[PDB]
């Protein structure tokens, strides 16, 4: 859709604070905050795949909209994830240990805009086509 492609991180706001809320420790936050990952999004039938590639860490999730799945996050959390399409926005919720975080991926102009919320912390990451 508007989401399919290869997307390179070009900007990030409040990622260190978000990682802190995720319980990521200092040395790991340092490494994560300088990463400039590629995000490759593809769709085949029901199944959407989101691949993250960086020198620090690669991740991949494949999923069906509305169908909860198990995910190991980049920072090694074991979470229950559910992703839906809401007014053109991919909305992801991860739930683990009575906590949750929400990740919204939207297409705005040339950009893929990713908004991550946990507790009072909102991080916004902007990716552009590679
Ligand atoms: C939480 C998180 C972490 C945690 C982490 C920190 C430090 C070391 C290892 C993990 N790391 C990454 C890197 C840079 C490492 C891939 C991401 C990420 N994925 N796509 N773009 N950025 C996210 C992330 C960002 C937005 C949406 C979903 C996940």
Residue numbers in the entry: 2 to 131
The authors write:
Fatty acid-binding proteins (FABPs) are involved in the uptake, metabolism and intracellular trafficking of fatty acids. Based on epidemiological studies and animal knockout models, the isoforms FABP4 and FABP5 were identified as potential diabetes and atherosclerosis targets. The aim of this study was to develop a dual FABP4/5 inhibitor and, to this end, high-throughput and fragment screens were conducted with X-ray crystallography as a follow-up method on those ligands that showed appreciable affinity and favorable physicochemical properties. Structure-based drug design (SBDD) based on initial hits from high-throughput and fragment screens yielded 216 ligand-bound structures of human FABP3, FABP4 and FABP5 isoforms, many of which were at resolutions of better than 1.2 Å.
